[PDB]
Every structure is written in structure tokens, then in C-alpha cells.
Amino acid sequence: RDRVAQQANELIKRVASELEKNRKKLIKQEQELADTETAELVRQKGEILTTSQNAQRYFKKYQKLKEAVKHLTNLIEETKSTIVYLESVDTMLGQASLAEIDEIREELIETGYLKRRHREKIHKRQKPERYLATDGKTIILVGKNNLQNDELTFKMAKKGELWFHAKDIPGSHVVITDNLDPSDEVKTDAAELAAYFSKARHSNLVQVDMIEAKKLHKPTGGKPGFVTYRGQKTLRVTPTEDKIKSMKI
Amino acid sequence: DRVAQQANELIKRVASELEKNRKKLIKQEQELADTETAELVRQKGELLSQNAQRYFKKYQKLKEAVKHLTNLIEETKSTIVYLESVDTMLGQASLAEIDEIREELIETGYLKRRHREKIHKRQKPERYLATDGKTIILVGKNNLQNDELTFKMAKKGELWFHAKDIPGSHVVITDNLDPSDEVKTDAAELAAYFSKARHSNLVQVDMIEAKKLHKPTGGKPGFVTYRGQKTLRVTPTEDKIKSMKI
């Protein structure tokens, strides 16, 4: 097919339009929240002052406003978590081969951003990409989309196996396999795979988090790839295209 | 001791991103060059388990990746160009105007509004009075104003100015459909002054009706497209610019 890259292009433009729409949506929601009449009504009708004793009108507003503000706060938090999820897709998208893009399409179908098309094939879901560390023994696994990310982290990872992710920015989940106490050389390799496969690819001294995989928590209803953890160690590495390629199986 | 320091981190941030994308650009161009081994494939197919077809299909697939890689490269270039425009607006802006440039960076995804940080109202383009003392010229002081001025505020017939091939403000002559060459020179001087070419002589600026400008779908704030424009060569003077300030 001579449309494969073109379709990869529409998909990329598609994800960006979603980011754009949700960012515009976020400022609208935050604006609405700031433009909301402050509820303290207990202020305009703690008035004990006789002067229809028609104050009730305001007590009932205090309640409607405290609730609207709560609701709007909830909506705003969901918009943000959508933006964070779409951002992770945009990152995976920009660093993917055409083949890996077929699987990210499947993710977008599952998360509701795309519908399969009339009589379009179903791309079989692949396993995380495997790497061989500089020690020449240890296998390191890297998720290439959020479905592989969740799978690697919550299905494939054993107890004791260490997990890596670039700190506070979108990127792949990275797990060290079959080595429960790795050298600082193997840890560094893993952290470098994490920093390389992230939004911080072409920058120096990237922070990556290191913590046992079994310590990660996926909140109920969380979007693919999103995780939670505390008490992690942090490393600072500088990924190199050569270094990464030397570990590529 | 915060307001300027925040103006400073913001300035350092755009610079880091530029550096990051330029490194990314060379890497992508390198990969694109290391991909020329595909001609080989096409040639052994050309000249002809071991079919002439096995080589044709290898080559069509390699050729699709080349296309994908080209699309990615164009995407990195347009990011750099966009970030370069922010870098230019940033270095010529007052602190007040920097609050609006922050709102643009929140919108294009480079900043996230912080805990309980206010929402700065978006302002209108800056107004200047041409040497004829009658005509109003408008100047975008950022890309949201650039877009607004060009695609929202500008009427039919109104002329639009921008420094040729370099980052700068959008400039529009207001309520004068046939301006004198004195008025055209003023507007171009504002465009050249409010650009990356501020302290240089003979700046080329493009002149064309605003309603002939097209913002490509998915295009970044400020970015536009046109053909068949006139060009002028002007030399901005800080005094001249100040005299036209309302």
C-alpha cells in the first residue's frame, strides 16, 4: 500500500487536533470556574436583620454554587487527565515506526478516538520491544504504546523486577528482566532506554524514576499507560542513539 | 523578585525547546540520509526462492518509511519555525505582553497553568498612527494577536505586512484601502522593526491583502500561507516607531 504513510499522517494530525480541542476546552472550563460567583452566601443571609424575609433564595444559591464548583472542579481534572493521555500518544506517535503505528491505532480504537473502518484488518497486538544490556546477559523490555505499557507493567513484570520511566514527562515503561539486583551499569542502560523513549529524547541529563514494578498502582478507570507510585529512586542519564542501537536485538 | 525571574525561566524554556528540536532535526535528517540504501533494492529489481518481486515489495515498504520520515522532518521544521517566532516575540516584549505570550504557550502545550495561577485576558493588537496622522496601523505583539488581527479583525481590501522569511509581528493598515507609498513605508517599518531584523538595514517585508492569507488546518498560532505578494525594503528607526505610538 502507498497510503500507509499518508494514513500515519492523518492519525498524527488527528491526535494533535484532539490535544488542541482539549486545551481550548480546559481554558474554557477554568475560565468558567473563575467567573463563578463565590459561594459564601452564609454572608448575604446570615443577615439577622429585620430591616419577605426572602433570604432563603440565597441560602439555596449557596448550596447550588458549592455543588457547581465541585462538579466543575471534577470536569477540569478529567480534561487534564485526557490531555496527559493524549500527550503520551503524541510522544509514542512521534518516535514510532509505521509498524508500531498500526498498534497505536488499535489503542486509539480501544480508547474511543478512532473507529475501525469498513472491512479493515485487525492488527495483532505485539509484545514489548526487547533489548540486551551492555553486560550481554540481561534482557530489558520497553513498551511501544500504552497497551504494551500496561501489559508489561501489570501482567508481565515479576516481583522484584525494576521499572523505569522518565520523571514527570510522557514516555515508555521500561522493565529489567530476570535480574533482581542489577549493576549500576545495567540500571543505567535501562534508565537510558526510558529517557530515550520519552519526550526528553534529545536533551541532556534526563531524570528517570526507578522503583519495583509491583509497587505501581493503576487507578480504577485510568487511561492506558497511566500509573501511580511513591518512594522511587531517581537517576540522571543522557541517552545516545548509538548506545540504544547497540542494545537493539 | 518573581515577575522578571518568571519572564526569565520562560525565556530559558523556549531556548531549551529550540535546542531540543534542532538536535532532533539533524538526527532525523541523518536517518533520512542513512535510508538511501533503498535505491540499491530498487535496482536489483529493476534489472530482472528468489523472485524479481521480492525486491519490488521490499522497496515499496522502504519507500513508505522514507515518506513517513519526510513527514516527520517537515513537522520538526515547523515546530522550530514556530518556537523561533516565540523567541522573537519574547525578546522584544514588555513584561505585560509576556503574560499573554505565556497564555499562547499554555495553548500550544508548552506550559501548564500552575496551581491557582490567574488567567490573563487576551489583549487587542497595538495601535499606531501613520505619518499622515489619520491612518491606524495595527501590530500583533504575539501569535494569538497575530491570528486575531489577520483572520478576525482584518477587513476586505486591508493590506498586511510581515518581514520576509523571518519571524515577526503581523501588521495591518486600518480603514485605508489605497494607502500612499508614505503609509506603506510606515507599515513595513513597523513590520521590520517588530521582527528578528530590528537592528539591521534594508529589511525586506512582504505586502499583500490580508484576505489572501490562508492558515493551514492544524497550523500553529501565527503561521500563514500566501503567494503573489509585493515586497518592500525599509530601514526601521526607533524614533520613527515611537513617534507613531499612540
**DSSP letter for each residue of chain B:** --HHHHHHHHHHHHHHHHHHHHHHHHHHHHHHHTTTTHHHHHHHHH-----SHHHHHHHHHHHHHHHHHHHHHHHHHHHHHHHHHHHHHHHT--HHHHHHHHHHHHHTTS----TT---PPPPPPEEEE-TTSS-EEEE-SSHHHHHHIIIII--TT-EEEEETTS-B--EEEES-SS--HHHHHHHHHHHHHTBTTTTSSSEEEEEEEGGG-B--TTPPTT--B--S-EEEEE---HHHHHHTB-
- In angstroms, rounded to a whole number, what is the distance separating the alpha carbons of residues B34 and B25? 14
Chain B interface, best mutation among A3, A4, A11, by max B CB count within 10 A: A4
Residue B41 grid cell? 533494492
Of A1, A94, A201, the CB nearest to B72: A94
Region for residue A160 given its phi and psi (left: phi exceeds 0; alpha: psi -120 to 50; beta: otherwise): left
The count of other CB atoms within 10 Å of the CB of residue A128 is 22
Cβ of A97 within 8 Å of Cβ of B65? The answer is yes
Please return the burial class of A116, using the count of CB atoms within 10 Å of its CB with bins 0-12, 13-18 and 19+.
exposed
Residue A162, H or E segment: strand A162-166
The count of other CB atoms within 10 Å of the CB of residue B223 is 16
Backbone angles phi, psi at B136, to 5 degrees: -90, 130
What are the Cα distances from residue B181, in Å, to A10, B131, B177, B236?
A: 45, 11, 12, 15
User: What contacts 24+ positions apart, CB below 8 Å, involve B170-174?
Assistant: B170/B139, B170/B140, B170/B145, B170/B146, B170/B222, B170/B224, B171/B137, B171/B138, B171/B139, B171/B140, B172/B125, B172/B137, B172/B138, B172/B210, B173/B130, B173/B135, B173/B136, B173/B137, B174/B135, B174/B136, B174/B137, B174/B138
Q: Is the dihedral of CA A17, B160, B78, B13 positive or negative?
A: negative
Non-local (6+) Cβ contacts of A24 within 8 A are: B107
Of A6, A12, A202, the CB nearest to B27: A202
Rg of chain A taking only CA atoms, in angstroms? 24
Q: How distant is the Cα of A52 from the closest Cα of chain B, in angstroms?
A: 39
Strand pairing of B126-129 and B136-139?
Answer: antiparallel
- Tell the residue number behind the cell numbers 534526563, with chain if given: A206
A174-177 β-sheet, strand order? A129-132, A139-142, A174-177, A162-166, A206-212, A233-237
Residue A246 grid cell? 547497540
Non-local (6+) Cβ contacts of A9 within 8 A are: B68, B71
Of A17, A30, A241, the CB nearest to B218: A17
Cβ of B24 within 8 Å of Cβ of A202? The answer is yes
Kindly list the residues from chain B whose CB atom is less than 8 angstroms away from the CB atom of residue A2. 60, 64
Contact B178, B159 (CB under 8 A): no
Of A12, A98, A202, the CB nearest to B65: A98
**Could you state, in order of their start, the residue ranges of all structural domains in chain B?**
1-123, 124-230
- In angstroms, rounded to a whole number, what is the distance separating the alpha carbons of residues A221 and B152? 41
Kindly list the residues from chain A whose CB atom is less than 8 angstroms away from the CB atom of residue B68. 4-5, 8-9, 98
- In angstroms, rounded to a whole number, what is the distance separating the alpha carbons of residues B173 and B163? 15
Kindly list the residues from chain B whose CB atom is less than 8 angstroms away from the CB atom of residue A239. none
Chain B interface, best mutation among A1, A32, A202, by max B CB count within 10 A: A202
Q: How distant is the Cα of A204 from the closest Cα of chain B, in angstroms?
A: 9
Tell which residue, B162, B159, B158, has the closest CA to residue B203. Answer: B162
- In angstroms, rounded to a whole number, what is the distance separating the alpha carbons of residues B75 and B220? 11
Q: Is the dihedral of CA A227, A230, A231, A236 positive or negative?
A: positive
- In angstroms, rounded to a whole number, what is the distance separating the alpha carbons of residues B238 and B244? 10
